[PDB]
């Protein structure tokens, strides 16, 4: 319910008081909270997109890593065909990446590395990935 959505909001926004790079352990806490709230996945996606819109530039790569971790965990746990998160994140993905590329110069390579992993592993189709690579 909305208690699980609130708990996800709390877990993700707590990053703003932590120094990047963000730990594997913290990412697991955020990802477990996302999956706990999966019956309200639309709210989870909205919260992650809000984080990426609002956060300081140092937190753009952490925000992208949250998308990566959630989408991969969901595909792993539920199957590539049944995952709700990838398709939902795909709706506003252009706007999301326009925000991510406001990161500091030394972080752009980290965004391109994730897009190349998504392409190679079929997390999204090339029709989605290529324009995001072109944006870099």
């Amino acid at each position: 319910g909305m208690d699980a959505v609130n708990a996800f909001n709390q877990e993700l926004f707590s990053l703003m008081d932590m120094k990047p790079p963000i730990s594997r352990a913290k990412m697991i806490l955020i990802t477990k909270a996302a999956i706990k709230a999966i019956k309200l996945y639309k709210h989870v996606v909205q919260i992650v997109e809000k984080f990426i819109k609002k956060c300081k530039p140092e937190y753009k790569v952490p925000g992208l890593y949250v998308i990566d971790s959630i989408v991969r965990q969901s595909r792993h746990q539920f199957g590539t065909d049944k995952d709700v998160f990838g398709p939902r994140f795909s709706k506003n993905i252009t706007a999301t990446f326009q925000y991510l590329y406001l990161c500091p110069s030394e972080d752009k390579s980290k965004i391109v590395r994730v897009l190349n992993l998504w392409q190679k592993n079929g997390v999204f189709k090339i029709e989605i990935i290529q324009p995001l690579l072109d944006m870099a």
């Binding site: 963000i22 730990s23 594997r24 352990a25 952490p62 990566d68 965990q73 994730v114 992993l117």
Partner: peptide
């Protein structure tokens, strides 16, 4: 504490 890596495998529900 080790940093998140996008090549690290997903966890199994422990």
């Amino acid at each position: 504490s080790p940093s998140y890596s996008p090549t690290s495998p997903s966890y199994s529900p422990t």
